[PDB]
Coordinates of C-alpha atoms in Angstrom, one line a residue:
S1 CA -78.5 36.3 -23.7
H2 CA -75.0 35.1 -22.3
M3 CA -71.6 36.2 -21.0
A4 CA -68.1 35.3 -21.6
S5 CA -65.1 36.5 -20.0
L6 CA -61.5 36.1 -20.4
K7 CA -61.4 35.7 -16.5
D8 CA -63.5 32.3 -16.8
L9 CA -60.5 30.5 -18.4
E10 CA -58.2 31.3 -15.5
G11 CA -57.4 28.1 -13.5
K12 CA -56.0 24.8 -13.9
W13 CA -56.9 22.4 -16.7
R14 CA -56.2 18.9 -17.4
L15 CA -56.5 17.0 -21.0
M16 CA -59.2 14.7 -21.1
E17 CA -59.5 14.0 -25.1
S18 CA -57.6 15.0 -28.4
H19 CA -58.4 14.7 -32.0
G20 CA -55.9 15.7 -34.7
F21 CA -52.8 16.5 -32.9
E22 CA -50.7 14.8 -35.2
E23 CA -51.9 15.8 -38.4
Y24 CA -51.8 19.3 -36.7
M25 CA -48.4 18.9 -35.9
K26 CA -47.4 17.6 -39.6
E27 CA -48.9 20.9 -40.8
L28 CA -46.6 23.1 -38.4
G29 CA -43.2 21.1 -40.0
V30 CA -42.7 18.7 -37.1
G31 CA -41.1 15.7 -37.8
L32 CA -42.9 12.3 -38.0
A33 CA -41.0 10.7 -35.0
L34 CA -41.2 13.6 -33.0
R35 CA -45.2 14.4 -33.6
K36 CA -46.0 10.7 -32.9
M37 CA -44.3 10.9 -29.2
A38 CA -45.8 14.3 -28.6
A39 CA -49.2 13.1 -29.0
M40 CA -48.8 10.9 -25.8
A41 CA -48.0 13.9 -24.0
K42 CA -50.9 15.0 -21.6
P43 CA -49.5 18.6 -20.1
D44 CA -51.9 20.3 -17.9
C45 CA -52.7 24.2 -19.0
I46 CA -52.9 26.8 -16.2
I47 CA -54.1 30.1 -17.4
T48 CA -54.1 33.4 -15.0
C49 CA -55.9 36.6 -15.8
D50 CA -55.2 40.3 -14.5
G51 CA -56.3 43.1 -16.4
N52 CA -55.8 42.4 -20.5
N53 CA -53.0 40.4 -18.9
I54 CA -52.8 36.7 -19.3
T55 CA -50.5 33.9 -18.4
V56 CA -50.3 30.4 -20.1
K57 CA -48.5 27.8 -18.6
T58 CA -47.9 24.1 -19.9
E59 CA -46.9 21.8 -17.0
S60 CA -45.7 18.5 -17.9
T61 CA -44.6 16.9 -14.6
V62 CA -41.0 17.4 -16.3
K63 CA -41.0 20.6 -18.3
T64 CA -42.7 23.9 -18.1
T65 CA -43.4 26.1 -21.1
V66 CA -44.9 29.6 -20.0
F67 CA -46.1 32.7 -21.9
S68 CA -47.2 36.4 -20.9
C69 CA -48.8 39.0 -22.5
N70 CA -51.4 42.2 -22.6
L71 CA -54.0 41.4 -25.1
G72 CA -53.8 43.3 -28.2
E73 CA -49.8 43.7 -28.3
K74 CA -47.4 41.5 -30.4
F75 CA -44.7 39.4 -28.5
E76 CA -42.2 37.0 -29.4
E77 CA -43.1 33.4 -28.5
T78 CA -41.0 30.3 -28.4
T79 CA -43.5 27.4 -28.8
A80 CA -43.4 23.6 -27.5
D81 CA -42.0 22.6 -30.8
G82 CA -39.5 25.2 -31.0
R83 CA -41.2 27.8 -33.7
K84 CA -40.0 31.3 -33.2
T85 CA -43.3 33.1 -33.7
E86 CA -44.7 36.3 -33.2
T87 CA -48.2 36.2 -31.4
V88 CA -51.0 38.3 -30.6
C89 CA -53.6 37.3 -28.2
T90 CA -57.0 39.1 -28.1
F91 CA -60.4 37.9 -26.6
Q92 CA -63.8 38.2 -28.7
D93 CA -66.6 36.0 -29.3
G94 CA -65.9 34.3 -26.0
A95 CA -62.6 33.1 -27.0
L96 CA -59.2 33.8 -26.1
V97 CA -57.9 33.9 -29.7
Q98 CA -54.0 33.2 -30.0
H99 CA -52.6 34.4 -33.2
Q100 CA -49.0 32.7 -34.5
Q101 CA -47.0 34.0 -37.3
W102 CA -43.6 33.0 -38.5
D103 CA -41.6 32.3 -41.8
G104 CA -44.4 33.8 -44.0
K105 CA -47.3 31.1 -42.3
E106 CA -50.1 31.4 -39.4
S107 CA -51.7 29.2 -36.6
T108 CA -54.7 30.1 -34.7
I109 CA -55.3 28.5 -31.3
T110 CA -58.6 29.4 -29.6
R111 CA -59.5 28.8 -26.4
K112 CA -63.3 29.0 -25.3
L113 CA -65.5 27.7 -22.4
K114 CA -68.2 25.3 -23.0
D115 CA -70.3 23.8 -20.2
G116 CA -67.6 24.4 -18.1
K117 CA -65.0 22.6 -20.0
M118 CA -62.0 24.4 -21.7
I119 CA -62.5 23.6 -25.7
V120 CA -59.0 24.5 -27.1
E121 CA -58.9 24.2 -30.8
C122 CA -55.6 24.6 -32.8
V123 CA -55.7 25.6 -36.7
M124 CA -53.3 25.3 -39.3
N125 CA -54.4 25.3 -43.1
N126 CA -56.8 22.5 -43.4
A127 CA -55.5 20.6 -40.2
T128 CA -57.4 21.3 -36.8
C129 CA -56.2 19.8 -33.3
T130 CA -59.8 19.9 -31.0
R131 CA -58.9 19.1 -27.3
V132 CA -61.5 19.1 -24.1
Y133 CA -59.9 20.1 -20.6
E134 CA -61.6 19.7 -17.4
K135 CA -61.2 22.1 -14.1
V136 CA -58.9 20.6 -11.4

C-alpha cells in the first residue's frame, strides 16, 4: 500500500536537472533561437493547494507566470511560451495532470512526487521533457 495527495506537491521547488526541454519546445512550435535560450532559464516552481484548488507559480527572478484553477474545470491559460490554450488540471494515479489544448493540438504536463523530489514530465507527440526539482 501507498498514498499520494495533491497537497504533497505544495511548496517551493528548484530545478535540479532537465532532459528534452528543447525537443519538447520544438514540438510546441517555438522558434530555433527562442528555445535554445529558454533551455538556460532555471525557474523555481511554487505550488499551493487548498481544496481542489491549485496555484502553480513559475518564478525566474525577473518574470512571474502564474496559473490558478479548480481541478476538473477548463480554464484559459496563456503559457510561458505564449500559447493560448484551454487547460484542465486533474489529480489521479498520484500525479497532477495538466492537459493543454490549442489550435487542434494537445500537450500533457504531469507532476508527481518520487522520493520527495518533484518529477515533471511534459509530453507533446513523440517529444518528452523530464525534469527533477528539489524542495527549498
